[PDB]
Structure 1
Amino acid sequence: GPSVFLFPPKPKDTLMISRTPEVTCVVVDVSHEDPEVKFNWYVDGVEVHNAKTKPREEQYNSTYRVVSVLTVLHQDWLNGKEYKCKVSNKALPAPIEKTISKAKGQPREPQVYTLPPSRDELTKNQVSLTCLVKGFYPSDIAVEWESNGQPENNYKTTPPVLDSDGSFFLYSKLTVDKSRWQQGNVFSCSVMHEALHNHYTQKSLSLS
């Protein structure tokens, strides 16, 4: 038979009121031979009726991928409500439920430190600007870079890693032309997380 995977909203979406946070139910391996899929959604137990049940894509294995989507209240998600996605594709002897909720526990504020390039990287053409983000809980977080209020794109951020004290840390690495590190521009790492004031903080970095 077909299987089911349930997904949390993107971290940035729950933290900024402008954005629309969603839980996503993904039904995989649904066959032509019995292709109709049903969904039912529950918050904290109660059936609600906000979900859209968007259709419906091909595949290599010629099986299907049926995806349903539910919008969620920012504060609900952050207060720990659990979301139940229920899938009925008879071909299923009984319908599948899956449940998801935010990680439990006292949210902890990230500490953010920008670290300049090593001396030895300076004999290169591009240099690495590093943002260390640590001491945060839960692991939901977003990190971005900018300069002169314009986004930097050439950066990569590690996944959150569980640290020895049970909090998380990560690093983000921005690569810039050494031209710019010397020509003196200011660069900033922005962090969004629920335990920050206004869910956001920014730390700057430039040549001292």
Structure 2
Amino acid sequence: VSAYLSRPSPFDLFIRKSPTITCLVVDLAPSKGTVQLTWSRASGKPVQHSTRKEEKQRNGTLTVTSTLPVGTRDWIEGETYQCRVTHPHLPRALMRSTTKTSGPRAAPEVYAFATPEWPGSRDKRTLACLIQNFMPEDISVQWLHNEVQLPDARHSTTQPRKTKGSGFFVFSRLEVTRAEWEQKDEFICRAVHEAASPSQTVQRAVSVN
């Protein structure tokens, strides 16, 4: 039985201005599960109504999540949120907490590239974006074509890794089709980051050819 508690995404926090946090508990012994995820703040101030969600997994196991809307200003100013997990079987005591990361801020550098044709694959290319030298590690990455944001499922972004310096980097991968680049041969990699500017976003355009 493990428990995790994530921070808001930069996209939700800055662009949407409706940040949330998610208490995720991955069980390894499901039974009569009246498992409770209790929310609180370090300050003692009221928490909003949260959303509980449970999904039975294929490997004969129960996964339970609770999502709490947080105040944008409350998060930025440094509030700490706490998820308490109470389980019947376990000795009733498990706590996870989250708050905005501290430390220096640094804006991301964004670089976007297009692969050349590989023999046997004329009607597709792979677009690669390198986002680097940012801190903290929290970052949202999106792709756009015709200034419409592409579904998130279309790309995959790597987890933040430290550079040889103090900042982090991610890579993002996007497969595109001939029909798309023939319609408009320009794709935008956009990184949303708090230290980024202006509007907490930095983006770079790339073309096939």
1:83 Cα deviation (Å)? Answer: 1.3
Correspondence for 1:173: 173
Give me the whole-angstrom Cα distance separating, in 2, the residues matched to 1:100 and 1:49. Answer: 14
What are the superposed Cα offsets for residues 31-52 of structure 1, whole Å, 9 maximum, x if unpaired?
535x323343222341533242
Deviation at 1:184, TM superposition (A): 6.4
Post-superposition shift, 1:195?
1.1
Residue by residue over 1:120-149, the C-alpha shift from the partner in whole angstroms, topping out at 9 and shown as x without a partner, is 759952333332211111111111222222
Do the aligned residues in 2 keep the contact of 1:39 with 1:53 (CA within 8 Å)? no
Cα separation, 2, equivalents of 1:95 and 1:65:
18
* 2:149 pairs with 1:151: yes
State the partner residue of 1:10.
9
Structure 2 match to 1:205: 206
Larger radius of gyration: 1
2: CA distance between counterparts of 1:206 and 1:60?
Answer: 41
Aligned to 2:194: 194
Quick one: distance in 2 between partners of 1:180 and 1:6? 38
- AA aligned opposite 2:199: N
Structure 2 letter corresponding to 1:93: P
Q: Normalising to structure 1: TM-score of the pair?
A: 0.77
Q: CA deviation at 1:7?
A: 2.7
Deviation at 1:179, TM superposition (A): 6.7
RMSD of the TM alignment (CA)? Answer: 3.1
Per-residue Cα deviation, 1:86-124 (whole angstroms, up to 9, x for no partner): 223344434222212232212210011223435x75995
3-state DSSP of counterpart to 2:38: strand
Matched, 1:37 2:35: yes
Gapped regions of structure 1 (runs ≥ 5): none
- CA deviation profile, 1:59-81 (whole Å, cap 9, x unmatched): 55766444333211123323432
Across the two proteins, how many residue pairs are aligned to each other? 204
Distance 1:31 1:124 in 2: 47
Q: Distance in 2 between matches of 1:49 and 1:6?
A: 16
Q: Quick check: 1:30–1:66 contact (8 Å CA) kept in 2?
A: no
Change (3 A) 1:92 1:48: farther
